[PDB]
Amino acid sequence: STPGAQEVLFRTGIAAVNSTNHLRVYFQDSHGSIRESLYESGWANGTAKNVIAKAKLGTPLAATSKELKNIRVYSLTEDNVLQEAAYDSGSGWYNGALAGAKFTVAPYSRIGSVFLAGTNALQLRIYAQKTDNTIQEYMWNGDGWKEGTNLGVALPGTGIGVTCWRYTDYDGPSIRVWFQTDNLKLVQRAYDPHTGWYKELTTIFDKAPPRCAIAATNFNPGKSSIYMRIYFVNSDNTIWQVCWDHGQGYHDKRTITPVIQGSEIAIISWEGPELRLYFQNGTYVSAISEWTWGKAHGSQLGRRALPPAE
Amino acid sequence: STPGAQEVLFRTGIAAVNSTNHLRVYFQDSHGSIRESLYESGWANGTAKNVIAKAKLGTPLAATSKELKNIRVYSLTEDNVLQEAAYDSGSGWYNGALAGAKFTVAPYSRIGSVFLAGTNALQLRIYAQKTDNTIQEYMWNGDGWKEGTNLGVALPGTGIGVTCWRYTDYDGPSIRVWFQTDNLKLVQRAYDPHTGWYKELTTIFDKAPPRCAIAATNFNPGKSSIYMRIYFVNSDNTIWQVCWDHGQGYHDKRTITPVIQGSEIAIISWEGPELRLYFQNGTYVSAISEWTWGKAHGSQLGRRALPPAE
Numbered sequence: 043s044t045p046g047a048q049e050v051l052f053r054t055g056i057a058a059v060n061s062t063n064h065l066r067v068y069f070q071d072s073h074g075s076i077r078e079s080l081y082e083s084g085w086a087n088g089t090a091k092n093v094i095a096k097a098k099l100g101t102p103l104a105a106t107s108k109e110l111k112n113i114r115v116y117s118l119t120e121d122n123v124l125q126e127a128a129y130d131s132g133s134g135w136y137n138g139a140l141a142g143a144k145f146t147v148a149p150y151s152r153i154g155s156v157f158l159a160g161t162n163a164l165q166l167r168i169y170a171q172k173t174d175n176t177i178q179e180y181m182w183n184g185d186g187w188k189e190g191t192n193l194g195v196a197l198p199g200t201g202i203g204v205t206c207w208r209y210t211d212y213d214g215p216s217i218r219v220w221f222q223t224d225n226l227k228l229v230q231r232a233y234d235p236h237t238g239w240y241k242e243l244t245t246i247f248d249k250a251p252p253r254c255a256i257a258a259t260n261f262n263p264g265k266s267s268i269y270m271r272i273y274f275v276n277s278d279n280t281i282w283q284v285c286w287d288h289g290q291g292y293h294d295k296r297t298i299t300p301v302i303q304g305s306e307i308a309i310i311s312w313e314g315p316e317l318r319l320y321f322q323n324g325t326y327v328s329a330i331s332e333w334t335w336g337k338a339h340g341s342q343l344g345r346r347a348l349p350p351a352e
Numbered sequence: 353s354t355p356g357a358q359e360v361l362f363r364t365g366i367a368a369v370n371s372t373n374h375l376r377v378y379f380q381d382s383h384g385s386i387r388e389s390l391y392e393s394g395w396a397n398g399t400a401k402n403v404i405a406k407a408k409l410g411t412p413l414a415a416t417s418k419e420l421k422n423i424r425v426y427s428l429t430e431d432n433v434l435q436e437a438a439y440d441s442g443s444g445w446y447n448g449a450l451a452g453a454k455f456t457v458a459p460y461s462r463i464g465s466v467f468l469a470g471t472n473a474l475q476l477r478i479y480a481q482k483t484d485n486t487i488q489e490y491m492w493n494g495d496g497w498k499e500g501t502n503l504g505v506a507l508p509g510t511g512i513g514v515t516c517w518r519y520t521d522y523d524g525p526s527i528r529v530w531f532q533t534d535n536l537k538l539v540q541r542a543y544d545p546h547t548g549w550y551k552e553l554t555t556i557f558d559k560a561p562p563r564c565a566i567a568a569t570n571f572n573p574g575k576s577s578i579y580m581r582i583y584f585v586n587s588d589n590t591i592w593q594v595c596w597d598h599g600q601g602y603h604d605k606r607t608i609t610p611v612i613q614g615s616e617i618a619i620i621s622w623e624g625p626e627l628r629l630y631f632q633n634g635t636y637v638s639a640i641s642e643w644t645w646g647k648a649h650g651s652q653l654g655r656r657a658l659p660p661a662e
């Protein structure tokens with residue numbers, strides 16, 4: 043390993059945001075502080091001078107953004123209250139109002155977060171697991187945090203994946219949420235602007251490891267078309283990918299890359315499509331590694347050890 | 353899962369002590385508290401009313417005992433100081449003097465602990481990883497905790513296995529310590545009463561997962577003979593066993609049982625030989641399971657879900 047890599051918590055939560063190939067990655071260090079590494083034509087930071095929040099050890103991490111003008115990063119306090127680190131262009135980093143609402147979740151809860159697409163207004167939906175193991179939606183729509191729709195019972199400590207886009211034909215955001223149920227299946231809940239939340243759980247994988255990491259993204263949204271990618275750590279100790287492609291539905295499942303036992307994962311994407319995965323695969327023991335996909339070279343490992351590791 | 357199982361921290365540290373088939377198992381709950389489950393012709397306890405200490409989330413755990421008269425359980429504070437929960441017959445549980453010595457270790461350090469065998473006096477040796485990644489020995493011999501021998505550089509966050517016995521022919525304890533080096537090998541350091549600490553690192557396994565759990569025991573010590581068992585989580589997501597048997601040396605390596613990704617492990621034994629392993633394999637998601645070995649039936653899974661899970 044390296045002195046920098048040692049600062050990164052083993053099996054740390056991971057989250058990432060971007061505006062095309064301008065990237066931010068968030069993770070937890072060994073003392074509980076949440077750090078930010080960035081990519082601006084080169085990787086940097088991720089040091090003790092790059093802390094945006096403090097959370098309990100082994101906290102989940104979630105993040106969403108509107109380009110890089112507005113960024114929100116979610117974690118858990120030591121009392122298992124959802125808290126929010128907020129960045130706004132022109133104001134910098136500050137404590138968000140979420141913790142003020144005093145939403146307590148399960149100790150083993152994960153978090154998902156999305157800005158609602160299709161509008162310039164700042165609307166947020168975040169998802170967590172309450173003490174009754176149900177996946178609760180919490181919302182921001184301009185004046186205060188409120189509980190939203192409850193998405194039903196999930197496995198204790200389930201991973202939570204979430205993505206959001208807007209069909210050109212429709213006037214409102216579409217939302218997809220992925221988690222693991224008691225039968226260890228991976229399933230999808232769905233919201234569309236013209237239907238509201240569908241009742242149907244859609245299975246995307248029959249049997250995954252318990253509390254496996256889950257993360258999802260979407261690209262190339264159209265009039266009534268979408269392409270989605272969902273990633274989870276399978277029992278063979280690699281990240282697996284599930285593909286939704288317009289005109290084919292869920293039509294592919296394949297391994298992507300090795301990871302350490304019990305690695306967390308983050309996924310970002312931009313039009314192209316370009317994909318970036320972040321995870322731990324044992325590089326310098328505890329460093330975060332990058333996996334890439336692009337039209338030019340296809341599936342390629344990226345940055346081997348993110349800052350502060352190198 | 354079950355409400356009881358949910359209280360058990362995922363990938364919790366695990367430690368166990370015994371006097372023959374009278375057993376104690378220690379683990380961490382989701383709020384950081386260290387609990388004790390027991391076996392006295394039946395499993396019990398492990399509830400919030402059975403807390404013996406409080407430690408940082410994801411703390412290592414180590415424990416050693418002289419039968420069940422004296423028990424010591426070691427963990428890390430949130431400042432990564434070694435602390436000790438102590439039980440003495442007739443006095444019950446109390447804070448041990450270890451934390452008073454203010455030994456700070458690496459955030460990712462593990463702990464090993466042994467009472468020195470062969471004497472009725474209460475002598476302790478405990479092993480941890482300092483911030484320079486060297487494995488430091490700390491000792492108790494009657495009046496105060498002191499740093500002992502340093503065993504050299506190990507992998508950052510290495511597991512630490514340790515066992516202790518007394519050869520009948522010799523007048524002093526023998527000690528064996530196992531950890532993982534930078535080349536991801538598993539190795540042995542050795543102390544004998546007539547030689548002191550040998551200089552030689554002995555390899556017992558060529559390549560294990562980074563920071564894999566490690567735990568060891570011994571049985572049937574003789575005049576100049578010993579039998580040892582070392583357990584670690586391999587890359588196939590099972591516990592593997594390494595056997596030392598008198599007249600054969602290190603002569604066997606085999607899988608034992610499946611475990612969750614990144615499970616910790618504990619091992620106890622008594623004359624027979626009887627062996628008990630404790631670990632997490634996904635039973636009720638987060639419960640601790642038992643694996644057994646005896647002369648009667650050989651390799652058999654034991655208690656599927658320890659208290660408080662059931």
Ligand SMILES: C[Se][C@@H]1O[C@@H](C)[C@@H](O)[C@@H](O)[C@@H]1O
Nearest residue numbers: 063064081318332334344345
């Ligand atoms: C053409 Se460099 C490629 O794309 C960048 C946006 C980053 O993901 C970098 O780590 C990767 O190696």
Ligand SMILES: C[Se][C@@H]1O[C@@H](C)[C@@H](O)[C@@H](O)[C@@H]1O
Nearest residue numbers: 066078080110111113129135
């Ligand atoms: C314009 Se400052 C730069 O860009 C923002 C998107 C944030 O990630 C901030 O922490 C970083 O220092």
Ligand SMILES: C[Se][C@@H]1O[C@@H](C)[C@@H](O)[C@@H](O)[C@@H]1O
Nearest residue numbers: 114128137138139140164182
């Ligand atoms: C302008 Se309030 C600021 O932005 C909102 C979108 C929310 O994230 C809120 O919690 C935060 O405090």
Ligand SMILES: C[Se][C@@H]1O[C@@H](C)[C@@H](O)[C@@H](O)[C@@H]1O
Nearest residue numbers: 167179181190191215233239
């Ligand atoms: C206008 Se309904 C409101 O916004 C939607 C996008 C969903 O988050 C729904 O659950 C919530 O109740």
Ligand SMILES: C[Se][C@@H]1O[C@@H](C)[C@@H](O)[C@@H](O)[C@@H]1O
Nearest residue numbers: 271283285294315317335341
């Ligand atoms: C047409 Se390749 C297909 O779509 C890409 C965008 C990637 O998700 C790749 O892993 C998948 O196999």
Ligand SMILES: C[Se][C@@H]1O[C@@H](C)[C@@H](O)[C@@H](O)[C@@H]1O
Nearest residue numbers: 373374391628642644654655
């Ligand atoms: C003859 Se029961 C057998 O031995 C006991 C000492 C315990 O380890 C128990 O869980 C196991 O099932």
Ligand SMILES: C[Se][C@@H]1O[C@@H](C)[C@@H](O)[C@@H](O)[C@@H]1O
Nearest residue numbers: 376388390420421423439445
């Ligand atoms: C004689 Se009390 C019983 O036995 C001791 C060995 C301890 O494990 C204690 O916590 C338990 O309640």
Ligand SMILES: C[Se][C@@H]1O[C@@H](C)[C@@H](O)[C@@H](O)[C@@H]1O
Nearest residue numbers: 424438447448449450474492
């Ligand atoms: C009679 Se002091 C008691 O017992 C010793 C063996 C040590 O574990 C010490 O730290 C503890 O406070």
Ligand SMILES: C[Se][C@@H]1O[C@@H](C)[C@@H](O)[C@@H](O)[C@@H]1O
Nearest residue numbers: 477489491500501525543549
């Ligand atoms: C009488 Se030397 C003392 O006790 C031995 C058993 C070892 O722990 C050694 O490292 C220590 O320095």
Ligand SMILES: C[Se][C@@H]1O[C@@H](C)[C@@H](O)[C@@H](O)[C@@H]1O
Nearest residue numbers: 581593595604625627645651
């Ligand atoms: C003579 Se079986 C041999 O020794 C036993 C005590 C156990 O460790 C078993 O796993 C091993 O295969």
